[PDB]
């Protein structure tokens, strides 16, 4: 699973089966890292109009 | 329901934005709706298609 | 049901009678008119391609 | 009815929902337009059975009791002169109720002046209503009263010429 | 255009992406029947109201403003003379007071 974003700590209480999370657009918003099983939130990097 | 004329405009604009965001989830006949999946799965001659 | 258009009123017309008001009501009514929308801008390249 | 076509059409998402919603908005907008145009009165007025309006003739614009559609002769001529997933929704107001609304508006503006549009319908004789309208355009009441027969004859002749011009122009 | 009734004034109010107009209007109420005439015949002359309308409560004739009942004595100050009584259809006989 590929993508770009800032990985931060999260407070979303994922259930044991649950691995990733999806927004309305279906783009991945949170992910569970292998090897260490922790839950990393994925926040898109800051952008806007010049 | 006194202020329905303004709420109608707000709901129409929010629904248009939600539809435009929702349209990214459609693959439109492709193998996937995610561009990164296509770019990581296929060679550029068929990933171009 | 078949909807009614209004309460039926028959105006007491005759060729030499008039109706003159003897009192009045100061009536305040609301009229709601939209003026503007939310100003939305879409980055076309980022929306199509990211 | 092709199921493979609909399975391929589900790949394009909610295009059909947007088209149906836009057409539904147009369909309710037409009923809103008719509601705003014709339903400007909440009282259904009737003319008196005796049509004594000081020589003024409204038979070409008042509803004809002999016709089952309850239309005016002018309105009857107007209605005579107009000739795969597709559905046509009927309008919310039928032509009989639109004719009833126009009949109520005509009865209000004949029997009550402009008073029914601003409040309760206050009755007034039609040669007095006409004099008030004459004073609205800056002509004295006496001019209307002295020449009331000529104005009534001119009005009846003009209404007949309107019916003749509508019947003679395609 | 500015509410139902005779428009007096209006107040604007801001609203989210909109405007709200408070239309203050005048609505007539408590109407009463009166017997009316187009003109008053007096001394062989026809008298017409300058701004009002001739009304009668049954025995006496008055002139009042059109949108509010305020009966006043039919005088020369509030009437004007045009022609004789032979032309106007529905002219009635009543005295016209001279101040
Ligand atoms: C003015 O007089 C007319 C007739 O004298 C009144 O009209 C009548 O009103 C009553 C009350 O609703 C009805 O039952 C009658 O059928 C009406 N008759 C006609 C011929 O319309 C009218 O109400 C009077 N106006 C006022 C303000 O009192
Ligand atoms: C004109 O109408 C007003 C109300 O719109 C009348 O005022 C009311 O009069 C009654 C009895 O006199 C009182 O009990 C109410 O409290 C009054 N209401 C208000 C808001 O003041 C007024 O009397 C009427 N005048 C005429 C001449 O009919
Ligand atoms: C008002 O106008 C109508 C039609 O414009 C008149 O009705 C006509 O009457 C004459 C003789 O009475 C007939 O020969 C015509 O055939 C009638 N025309 C129609 C269309 O029916 C009516 O007489 C006029 N006056 C009144 C008081 O109603
Ligand atoms: C019509 O109005 C006039 C004037 O307002 C009334 O005449 C007055 O009536 C009162 C009541 O009896 C008397 O006290 C006055 O003396 C009368 N004035 C004059 C100049 O005579 C008249 O009664 C009213 N008529 C009706 C049927 O209401
Ligand atoms: C109004 O007054 C006029 C004049 O005072 C009346 O006309 C008179 O009527 C009588 C009988 O009808 C005749 O003998 C006179 O010759 C007429 N005089 C004039 C100058 O025309 C008229 O009848 C009165 N109308 C009412 C309704 O009372
Ligand atoms: C390796 O991944 C597994 C999950 O499949 C995990 O249980 C284990 O702790 C991981 N070990 C190390 C050394 O990361
Ligand atoms: C009003 O009609 C009556 C008949 O109902 C008649 O006697 C009277 O002269 C008419 N008045 C006017 C001003 O036309």
Helical proportion of chain A?
under 10%
What is the overall shape of chain A?
A: elongated
- Strand arrangement in the largest pleated sheet of chain A: 1-4-3-2
- Class computed from helices, strands and strand pairing of chain A: mainly beta
Q: Mind summarizing the main beta sheet of chain A? A: 4 strands, antiparallel
| Relative strand content of chain A | 25-35%
Radius of gyration of chain A: 12 Å
This entry's quaternary arrangement is part of a larger assembly
End-to-end gap of chain A: 31 Å
List ligands, each type once.
a molecule of 2 linked components (NAG-NAG), 2-acetamido-2-deoxy-beta-D-glucopyranose
Helix tally of chain A? 0
How many strand elements of chain A? 4
Along the chain, the helix and strand elements of chain A come as EEEE
Protein name (chain A): Spike protein S1
């Amino acid at each position: 699973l590929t993508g770009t974003g800032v990985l931060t700590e999260s407070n979303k209480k994922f259930l044991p089966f649950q691995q990733f999370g999806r927004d309305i657009a279906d783009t991945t918003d949170a992910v569970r890292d292998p090897q260490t099983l922790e839950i990393l939130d994925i926040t898109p990097c800051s952008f806007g109009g010049v | 329901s006194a202020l329905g004329k303004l709420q109608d405009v707000v709901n129409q604009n929010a629904q248009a934005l939600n539809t435009l965001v929702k349209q990214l989830s459609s693959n439109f006949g492709a193998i996937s709706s995610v561009l990164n999946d296509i770019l990581s799965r296929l060679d550029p001659p068929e990933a171009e298609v | 049901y078949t909807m009614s258009l209004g309460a039926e009123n028959s105006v007491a017309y005759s060729n030499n009678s008039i109706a003159i008001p003897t009192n009045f009501t100061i009536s305040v009514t609301t009229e709601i008119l939209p003026v503007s929308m939310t100003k939305t801008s879409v980055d076309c390249t980022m929306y199509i391609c990211g | 009815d092709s199921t493979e076509c609909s399975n391929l059409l589900l790949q394009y998402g909610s295009f059909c929902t947007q088209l149906n919603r836009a057409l539904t908005g147009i369909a309710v907008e037409q009923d809103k337009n008719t509601q705003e145009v014709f339903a400007q009165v909440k009282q259904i007025y009737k003319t008196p059975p005796i049509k004594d309006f000081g020589g003024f003739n409204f038979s070409q614009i008042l509803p004809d009791p002999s016709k089952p559609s309850k239309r005016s002769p002018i309105e009857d001529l107007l209605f005579n002169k107009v000739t795969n997933g597709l559905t046509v929704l009927p309008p919310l107001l039928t032509d009989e109720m639109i004719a009833q609304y126009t009949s109520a508006l005509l009865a209000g503006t004949i029997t009550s002046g402009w008073t029914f549009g601003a409040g309760p319908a206050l009755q007034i004789p039609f040669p007095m209503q006409m004099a008030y309208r004459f004073n609205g355009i800056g002509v004295t009441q006496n001019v209307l009263y002295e020449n009331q027969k000529l104005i009534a004859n001119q009005f009846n002749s003009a209404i007949g010429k309107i019916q003749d011009s509508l019947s003679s122009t395609p | 255009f500015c509410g139902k009734g005779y428009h007096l004034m209006s107040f604007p109010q801001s609203a989210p992406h909109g405007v709200v107009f408070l239309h203050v209007t005048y609505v007539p109420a408590q109407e009463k029947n009166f017997t009316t005439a187009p003109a008053i015949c007096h001394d062989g002359k026809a008298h017409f109201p300058r701004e009002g309308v001739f009304v009668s409560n049954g025995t006496h004739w008055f002139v009042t403003q059109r949108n509010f009942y305020e009966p006043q004595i039919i005088t020369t100050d509030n009437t004007f003379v045009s022609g004789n009584c032979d032309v106007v259809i529905g002219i009635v006989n009543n005295t016209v007071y001279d101040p």
